[PDB]
């Protein structure tokens, strides 16, 4: 079965692999994140409710007052999205919060509160998100690109051989909280652990432990094993477990029970270790020199006197052991230090640090954190308590805690937000184990370590930042002594929250300005993943490794689509199927593999879990049962790919196109061209200005329909039915009964947006693609947006292309276009400009917009009306006056030079309180009549639909064939019905419609007031006049035109039609490319694309010949069936027998100018299939035709490739690039401003150009460029006066920039003098 929109034009689809999972919603990330942020979400987790609940409980310093919130709600936006866009106001919704205030009795908080206050409060405006995923902030659509950053947690960086030149690795550990201070642990070259808080100066690591009220003995116990030694009568026998010493040489002779098992000076292997373990002789005797090496662990005090024989971390010695012998202590503690296994890292740090008590560590911490201030015990205690264990100053999010526990190999997933002493100790122990060789470092680029932060999370963080200061202000206000003085409304201020949200949404590194030249550009901009922004890398700081593509990018981030240039790799687009995890990481679907069978259920795997399993490749033969016939199916294990047995595999790729982005997947034959050219082609599709008429690609990937419908450009029917009324402005759909709601059933009206300026100054219009009475269902496209054709993304046009050199006009990348391309206007693009005029309130009287302009000709005023505004539809040109704008004393807004287009409409905004000029009256009365007409038309159409649905109720025995006709026109809902209770229902519905039209007229009055009310304006201007010019561009030499496989070029010459090469039948080729562009930059996709395009157009021409002359439907139908059944093993399987024999005619009509072909990115048509398709038509299999020269008339040798290629016109126009200047304005430094074409700037003669000028030995040219054309004002005027008199002299003079520099240096107390 096929949809009705599919019936009219169904694209032939190659591709053997049957897709299991369809492409998800393209913009799911933005919508899902914002819906999570702002919605009624109880229990906390993440959302606005969680942010409200985290902070709002108020503790007052003896204020006795508690303030807490009950609930929050969102008010209806004052204006609709279109109204906000037109007015230039933010599309936001008020945030209403029900706050409660309770104060207890004095010296009595135990009982009920003496006063309980509850009052809804207004907190601020939250900019709501449009349906498509865009934000309207000041009448301009903006998008918030999701940010990618290091996930909160703990990482262990190698820092391998960067310093010390010795090749040693300085292992370090880092803790990154979501909000707090960084904590670092570092290894010095001397094997000493150092701690750095917030990237301050180094500090001994054991200072933190001492600051954690940890005894030195406790530290030794935690970070070191204890070797028990005892004082005995017989040689003072040592205790030594055999398992402790493994794989080390023994200096002493090892005798157990008298018999020697391991001799002195010999290492111990496994057999002696096992022998000793079996013996289990823990006691041993060593020479008195052996004990001297060890270091004591615990404090030992003489029982006789109480003095300290040896404190902790003190090396043992002969006198020390003698004193212990006099002490008679039966237990001697020595730290188990083994150079190969362990390390005395902690012991040396305790040896180095000067602190010996908690207070010493605390004052050292205070000194390091806040230098200069004197050390205070209580202040230091508070500072350390608030650094890492206070909820407000420090917090690890749930994702951060999960990552921390997972890195520390703990089973618990969720824990406290703040750190703990055990956590720090475990981090340091893990770092020590890393140093000893037990464990591995973590790579930063791993996609398990990076996180996705969308608009919802960043908006929530900004809201929290705004809320904390309001909370502080409320706490400060509550400190004042008051009781029931005021409501909990004047206490809070909406300004901090409003500013904190508006600044983020309007002025941020990630609140990017949307580009709307294509539906594809709109889709891609919402799918971007930018590593920059707040809390992220910068272009300069980003290293070489970050820009590289990691092995874990497979299926998560596109390896192809990324901007070439400064930020290469820092910005990249999310892949097709990749959807963010609930924690924040990136996931990709995978087909589960049972025992030898590939199943249907799909598991989304994150980055970490993907490593363990063995995942098969997408391109492997399944044969509709599983059991890959080859027993060496290629699979990619952890970070590597190798062959595996068919049973070893555990997962499968869902589809071939799950690696590339949406933008890069539009390219056909993506697997046949180099990655560089694919990157260029993916980046160039986003800059294709929409053409005058959309033309579907003859050969495409096949997902263009999905990206067209999933954007907001096309109008898609939400409820199916029949098209009651269609028109170039709007479409009205009569909903089918089953989908039609019972209560107040009506018909939905689709209002199309006609020519409107986009962000890139291109036209946006909706074209109705449905006819009158044509049935539609839910989800079919009703109107085509910009650059879409029947619901398919039509970026450019497909034209005949020949690959041959032609008299050097296509030399390196130039393109020669036939004049036939210009003649039929198939590359013409509309451009809408916006010129604004403001009636500023300057001194000497306000500036007025009036018709009479002093000292100008009447011809200028002829175009203007009597009110000083330009007539709608006037063919203005550069310099023509658009508004009066007379200033007391002239300065009238006029069309800038080089602009020539009709003025489509004018919008006038007038300050509330001042008079309205006659054109303002005309505009407001026309808009009021238009609003009245719209309301009356919708009311009449809805009335007709409702009264027709009432007839259906009246049909059931309540009305006859003549009863309704004889009934008066006011009471069709009042008729004798059999049921006698559904009659009461009809009366209720009639009353509901009566009140509904009262509501409609009330909303009409509200709309009239909105038009009548003085719209808000910035202070200092009475009225704002906006004039929209609409210039129609045309192709010409110098324009940039590009294909899809990164083969950009510039138009060189518009060849006449007769000069172009022509084939045997006489059809000229539209464009000739250059063959030399293919072998060097390997993009064979275009050659295969042009062969397939020739095949498609051959099929189209065959059915056109079958249609130009009358042919029976059977012949045409069987030919179309043969064309659709061409593939050897394709999955399309269209049968024309199920068609209605009239829809076949419509399909043939839609196919007569081409046969669309779908070739997925990595499962496209093979060469043999293309040759077979060419043989289906009457075309050569080789794909090359013998062309005849247009002018000479002699046929070319070496048959030349000819075919149809999809070519785009890029936004890099030529009339917007060409510029020139002879004399204009100058700056304060008297150089020309070079605002470019904006203020008639002069091209800058840069520093690297004077080097070339003086390398030639050209002194006079350099002098004139430095002085006479730039800065010497006297030189400038003298040179200008000399030129017009026929003289070409030159007065050098002195540049003004040098004098400015002289004054600048003199301003610093440094004497500059041009001494003679």
């Amino acid at each position: 079965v096929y949809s009705y929109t599919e019936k009219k034009r169904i694209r032939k689809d190659f591709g053997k692999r049957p897709q299991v999972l369809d492409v998800p919603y393209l913009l799911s990330i933005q919508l899902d994140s914002f819906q999570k942020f702002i919605e009624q979400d109880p229990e906390g987790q993440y959302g606005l409710e969680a942010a409200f609940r985290s902070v709002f409980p108020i503790q007052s310093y003896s204020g006795n007052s508690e303030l807490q919130y009950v609930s929050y709600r969102l008010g209806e936006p004052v204006f609709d999205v279109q109204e906000c866009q037109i007015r230039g106001v933010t599309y936001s919704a008020p945030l209403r919060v029900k706050l409660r205030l309770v104060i207890y009795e004095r010296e009595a908080p135990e009982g009920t509160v003496k006063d309980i206050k509850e009052q809804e409060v207004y907190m601020g405006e939250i900019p709501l998100m449009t349906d498509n995923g865009t934000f309207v902030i000041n009448g301009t659509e903006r998008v918030i690109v999701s940010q990618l950053h290091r996930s909160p947690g703990v990482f262990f960086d190698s820092d391998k051989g960067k310093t010390h030149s010795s090749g040693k690795v300085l292992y370090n550990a880092r803790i990154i909280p979501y909000r707090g201070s960084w904590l670092d642990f570092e290894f010095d070259p001397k094997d000493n652990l150092f701690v750095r808080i917030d990237r301050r100066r180094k500090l001994p690591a054991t200072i933190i432990l001492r600051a954690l009220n940890y005894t030195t003995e406790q530290i030794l116990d935690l970070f070191f094993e204890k070797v028990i030694f005892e004082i005995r009568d017989n040689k003072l026998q040592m205790e030594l477990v055999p398992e402790r010493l493994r794989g080390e040489t023994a200096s002493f002779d090892i005798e157990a029970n008298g018999k020697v098992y391991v001799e002195k000076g010999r290492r111990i292997t496994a057999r002696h270790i096992r022998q000793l373990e079996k013996d289990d002789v823990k006691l041993i005797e060593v020479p008195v020199e052996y004990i001297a090496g060890k270091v004591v662990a615990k404090d030992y005090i003489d029982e006789s006197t109480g003095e300290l024989i040896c404190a902790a971390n003190m090396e043992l010695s002969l006198d020390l052991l003698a004193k212990l012998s006099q002490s008679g202590h039966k237990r001697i503690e020595t730290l188990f230090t083994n150079d190969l296994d362990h390390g005395p890292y902690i012991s040396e740090t305790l040896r180095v640090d000067p602190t010996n008590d908690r207070l010493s560590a605390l004052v050292e911490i205070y000194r390091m954190m806040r230098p200069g201030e004197p050390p205070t015990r209580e202040a230091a205690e508070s500072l350390f308590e608030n650094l890492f264990f206070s909820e407000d100053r420090y917090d690890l999010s749930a994702v951060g805690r999960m990552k921390f526990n997972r890195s520390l190999l703990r089973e618990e997933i969720e824990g406290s937000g703040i750190l703990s002493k055990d956590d720090i100790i475990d981090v340091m122990k893990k770092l020590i184990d890393i140093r000893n060789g037990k464990g591995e470092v973590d790579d930063i680029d791993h996609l398990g370590n990076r996180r996705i932060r969308s608009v919802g999370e960043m908006a929530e963080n900004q809201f929290r930042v705004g809320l904390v200061r309001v909370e502080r202000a409320v706490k400060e206000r509550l400190s004042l002594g008051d009781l029931d003085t005021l409501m909990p409304q004047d206490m809070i201020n909406a300004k901090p929250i409003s500013a904190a949200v508006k600044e983020f949404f309007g002025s941020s590194q990630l609140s990017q300005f949307m580009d709307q030249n294509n539906p594809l550009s709109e889709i891609t901009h919402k799918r971007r993943i930018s590593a920059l922004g707040p809390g992220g890398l910068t272009r300069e700081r980003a290293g070489f490794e970050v820009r590289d593509v990691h092995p874990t990018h497979y299926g998560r981030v596109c390896p192809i689509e990324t901007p070439e240039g400064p930020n290469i790799g820092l910005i990249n687009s999310l892949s097709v199927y990749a959807q963010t995890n609930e924690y924040g990481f990136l996931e990709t679907p995978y087909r589960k593999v049972t025992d030898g069978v590939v199943t249907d259920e799909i598991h989304y795997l994150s980055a970490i879990e993907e490593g363990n399993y063995v995942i098969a490749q997408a391109n492997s033969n399944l044969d509709e049962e599983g059991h890959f016939v080859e027993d060496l199916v290629t699979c990619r294990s952890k970070g590597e790919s190798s062959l595996f047995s068919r049973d070893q595999v555990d997962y499968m790729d869902v589809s071939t196109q799950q690696v590339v982005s949406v933008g890069a997947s539009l390219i056909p034959f993506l697997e046949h061209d180099d990655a560089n050219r694919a990157l260029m082609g993916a980046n160039m599709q986003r800059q294709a200005v929409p053409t005058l008429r959309a033309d579907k690609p003859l050969v495409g990937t096949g997902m263009e329909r999905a990206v067209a419908v999933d954007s907001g450009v096309t109008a898609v029917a939400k409820r199916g039915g029949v098209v009651q009324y269609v028109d170039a402005s709007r479409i009205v759909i009569k909903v089918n009964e089953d989908e039609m709601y019972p209560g107040e059933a009506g018909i939905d009206i689709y209002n199309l947006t006609k020519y409107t300026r986009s962000n890139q100054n291109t036209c946006i219009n909706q074209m109705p693609c449905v006819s009158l009475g044509e049935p539609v269902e839910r989800g079919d496209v009703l109107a085509d947006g910009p650059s879409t054709d029947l619901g398919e993304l039509a970026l450019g046009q497909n034209m005949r292309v020949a690959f041959m050199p032609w008299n050097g006009y296509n030399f390196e990348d130039s393109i020669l276009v036939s004049e036939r391309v210009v003649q039929e206007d198939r590359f013409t693009t509309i451009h809408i400009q916006e010129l604004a005029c403001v009636s500023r309130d300057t001194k000497l009287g306000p500036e007025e917009i009036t018709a009479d302009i002093p000292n100008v000709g009447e011809a200028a005023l002829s175009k203007l009306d009597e009110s000083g505004i330009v007539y709608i539809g006037a063919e203005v040109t550069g310099g023509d006056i658009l508004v009066g704008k007379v200033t007391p004393k002239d300065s009238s807004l006029r069309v800038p030079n080089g602009v020539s287009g009709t003025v489509i409409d004018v919008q006038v905004f007038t300050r509330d309180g001042v008079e309205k000029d006659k054109r303002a009256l005309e505009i407001e009365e026309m808009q009021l009549k238009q609003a009245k007409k719209d309301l009356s038309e919708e009311l009449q159409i809805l009335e007709a639909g409702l009264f027709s649905r009432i007839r259906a109720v009246l049909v059931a025995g309540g009305v006859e064939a003549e009863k309704l006709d004889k009934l008066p026109r006011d009471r069709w809902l009042e008729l004798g019905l059999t049921d006698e209770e559904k009659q009461n229902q009809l009366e209720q519905l009639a009353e509901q419609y009566d009140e509904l039209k009262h509501e409609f007229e009330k909303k009409l009055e509200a709309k009239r007031r909105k038009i009548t009310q003085g719209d808000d304006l910035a202070p200092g201007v009475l009225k704002i006049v906006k004039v929209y010019l609409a210039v129609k561009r045309r192709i010409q030499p110098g324009d940039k035109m590009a294909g899809r496989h990164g083969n950009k070029g510039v138009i060189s010459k518009i060849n006449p039609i007769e000069d172009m090469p022509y084939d045997e039948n006489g059809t000229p080729v539209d464009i000739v490319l250059n063959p030399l562009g293919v072998p060097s930059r390997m993009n064979i996709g275009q050659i295969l694309e042009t062969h397939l395009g020739m095949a498609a157009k051959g099929i189209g021409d065959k059915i056109n010949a079958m249609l130009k002359q009358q042919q029976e439907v059977a012949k045409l139908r069987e030919f179309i069936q043969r064309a659709y059944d061409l593939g050897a093993d394709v999955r399309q399987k269209v049968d024309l027998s199920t068609f209605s024999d009239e829809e076949v005619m419509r399909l043939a009509e839609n196919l007569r100018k081409g046969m669309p072909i779908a070739t997925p990115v990595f499962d496209g048509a093979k060469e043999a299939e293309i040759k077979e398709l060419l043989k289906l038509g009457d075309l050569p299999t080789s794909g090359q035709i013998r062309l005849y020269d247009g002018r000479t008339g002699e046929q070319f040798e070496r048959p030349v490739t000819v075919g149809y290629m999809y070519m785009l016109k890029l936004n890099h126009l030529v009339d917007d690039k060409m510029h020139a200047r002879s004399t204009g304005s100058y700056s304060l430094v008297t150089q020309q401003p070079l605002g470019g074409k904006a203020q008639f700037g002069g091209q800058r003669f840069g520093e690297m150009e004077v080097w070339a000028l003086e390398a030639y030995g050209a002194a006079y040219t350099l002098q004139e460029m430095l002085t006479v054309k730039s800065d010497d004002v006297n030189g400038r005027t003298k040179m200008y006066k000399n030129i017009v008199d026929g003289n070409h002299q030159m007065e050098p003079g002195m540049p003004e920039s040098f004098n400015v520099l002289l004054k600048e240096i003199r301003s610093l107390g440094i004497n500059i003098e041009l001494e003679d």
Binding site: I560, D674, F811
Partner: protein
């Protein structure tokens, strides 16, 4: 606001913005001569406005400046006639956005065209590094008379034939002209008109035009060849030669002095460059400019007539590729099986796998190239015969027009092993070429290196720019001030031998440099070269015959002149066949010549003798 890039010193004092300047997209114009350049009518009208005003006042159409300004704004008919007079012989300076070479800015004689794009000469674009893909170029107008004379004498494109970095020519047929010349100068075993005997090149052109003879048919043409045996005199030599029709046709544009041996060969890019250099050496500059224009026109015309095209049937996959792949896979499986038993360690297994795959890739590439180069087999006069193929991709590769051996290897053979981002080599190479499909995994492996190279270039640009700036400033002051120091100290020039073949021939290092001390003949008590003579091609050739390894040469570091170097120590100008002129800014030239190739430079027993001696 004084220091840094944004300060006065860098932004405003050395980077003053200039009036009388414009910017527009560039496009190729094959109609132009070497010294000319296209210029839009509107751009020319705006740039030359004061000259137009002056001409209007002088002629008398406009009495006052306001009247002339209004008339120009009206762009009346008379204004265009006045404009044509103004820009008749007024050079304009054209430069690209990055100006690395001295040749980054050049002067052209402009011609008025319609449109909004500047038309640039195809041969010039090699020095500018222009690509005609949205490239932009700014124009400047020299106002003063001294500036006009200066641009004409120094900056004009016809003057810049040899780059200052090295004596090699800077203009050379590059992409389509070289392909057309290679197609024209080629031989086919059997072709229409073979075996004919022709009167001269005009007859060959007449035969090819009328279609009676093919462009590649081997014939015997009488050729009038001029050799300047006498000093300043040419003697004609006429003889029958065994050359194709295409070579005979091309002989018409060749100047008088050059011999016929240059045209008779296949004429690849190196051959065309050598022919242009020979013309420059023999007949000077003006014949070289005329010859370059004629070569470009002829190459474009015959490349267009050839109709060379690329198609999916041009890239042929060798028939033995599957067998080689099967053998390599069998060997790697055998090595893996040996590793499974533990007989061979993992590291040596990986090294052996790498070696096996490299050998298989070499075998596949060699088989494909052997099948490609001689693919065409021609049957002539009965028995069959072999010849160099006419495959379009192979014709592009051989002529040097575009592509290389590696590009063809990737198009019709194994792509080879691809390195990981860390630098290690992936065990399994990319078996599939670009003519056939690449599965997802192989595309990912390719994308690794592609992204690494793109980032490398993106940062190479900035690093090279910084190095060039430092070099230019450290050597700004050096200017050839004096003429001779009379010093005797010098450095010793010997060829560099790094344990093998000659890395630099001796004649290349010492060419164009004067000697500090008289060179001693291999015959004892005899001197080959005087003390202070400048070594040139002839002196080096005489030095070649005696072949003395060590020659003392005056150098810049040994120059005893203060605040500058003498003309003798520097030697040849490397851009003209002359000792360097006094006042030349050699420091900036040296710094720019060093810094220009910086973008190309990436960031990241027993002793047995080969030959008897």
């Amino acid at each position: 606001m004084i220091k840094g890039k944004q300060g006065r010193f860098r932004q405003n004092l050395l980077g003053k913005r200039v009036d009388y300047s414009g910017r527009s997209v560039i496009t190729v114009g094959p109609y132009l001569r070497l010294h000319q350049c296209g210029l839009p009518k509107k751009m020319a009208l705006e740039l030359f406005k004061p000259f137009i005003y002056g001409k209007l006042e002088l002629r008398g159409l406009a009495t006052t400046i306001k009247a002339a300004k209004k008339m120009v704004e009206r762009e009346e008919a008379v204004v265009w006639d006045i404009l044509d007079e103004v820009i008749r012989e007024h050079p304009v300076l054209l430069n690209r956005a990055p100006t690395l070479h001295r040749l980054g800015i050049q002067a052209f004689e402009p011609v008025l065209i319609e449109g909004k794009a500047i038309q640039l000469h195809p041969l010039v674009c090699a020095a500018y590094n222009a690509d005609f893909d949205g490239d932009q170029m700014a124009v400047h107008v020299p106002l003063t008379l001294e500036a006009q004379l200066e641009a004409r004498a120094l900056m004009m494109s016809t003057n810049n034939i040899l780059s200052p970095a090295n004596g090699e020519p800077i203009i050379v047929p590059s992409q389509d002209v070289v392909l057309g010349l290679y197609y024209m100068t080629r031989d086919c075993v059997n072709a229409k008109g073979e075996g004919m005997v022709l009167t001269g090149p005009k007859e060959a052109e007449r035969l090819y035009r009328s279609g009676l003879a093919s462009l590649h048919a081997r014939v015997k043409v009488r050729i009038t060849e001029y050799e300047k045996d006498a000093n300043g005199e040419l003697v004609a030599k006429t003889s029958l030669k065994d050359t194709t029709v295409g070579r005979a046709i091309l002989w018409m544009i060749v100047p008088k002095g050059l011999p016929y041996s240059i045209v008779n060969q296949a004429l690849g890019k190196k051959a065309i460059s050598k022919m242009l250099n020979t013309c420059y050496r023999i007949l000077g500059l003006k014949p070289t400019v005329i010859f370059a224009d004629q070569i470009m026109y002829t190459g474009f015309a015959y490349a267009a007539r050839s109709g060379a095209s690329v198609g999916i049937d041009d890239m042929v996959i060798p028939e033995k590729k599957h067998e080689i792949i099967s053998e390599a896979e069998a060997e790697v499986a055998e090595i893996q099986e040996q590793f499974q038993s533990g007989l061979v360690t993992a590291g040596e297994r990986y090294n052996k796998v790498i070696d096996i795959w490299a050998a298989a890739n070499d075998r596949v590439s060699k088989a494909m190239m052997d099948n490609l180069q001689t693919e065409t087999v021609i049957n002539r006069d009965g028995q069959e015969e072999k010849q160099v193929s006419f495959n379009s991709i192979y014709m592009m590769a051989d002529s040097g027009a575009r592509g290389s051996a590696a590009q063809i290897r990737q198009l019709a053979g194994m792509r080879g092993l691809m390195a990981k981002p860390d630098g290690s080599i992936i065990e399994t190479p990319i078996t599939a070429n670009f003519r056939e499909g690449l599965n997802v995994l192989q595309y990912f492996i390719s994308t690794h290196g592609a992204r690494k190279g793109l980032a490398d270039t993106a940062l190479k640009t900035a690093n090279s720019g910084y190095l060039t700036r430092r070099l230019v400033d450290v050597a700004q002051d050096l200017v050839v001030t004096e003429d001779d120091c009379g010093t005797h100290e010098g450095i010793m020039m010997t060829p560099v031998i790094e344990g093998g073949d000659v890395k630099e021939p001796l004649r290349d290092r010492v060419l164009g440099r004067v000697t500090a001390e008289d060179v001693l003949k291999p015959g004892t008590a005899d001197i080959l070269v005087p003390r202070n003579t400048l070594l040139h091609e002839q002196w080096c050739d005489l030095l070649e015959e005696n072949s003395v390894d060590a020659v003392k040469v005056r150098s810049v570091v040994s120059c005893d002149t203060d605040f500058g170097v003498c003309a003798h120590c520097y030697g040849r100008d490397l851009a003209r066949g002359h000792i360097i002129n006094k006042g030349e800014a050699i420091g900036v030239i040296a710094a720019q010549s060093i810094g220009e190739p910086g973008t190309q430079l990436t960031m990241r027993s027993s002793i047995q003798v080969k030959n008897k001696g």
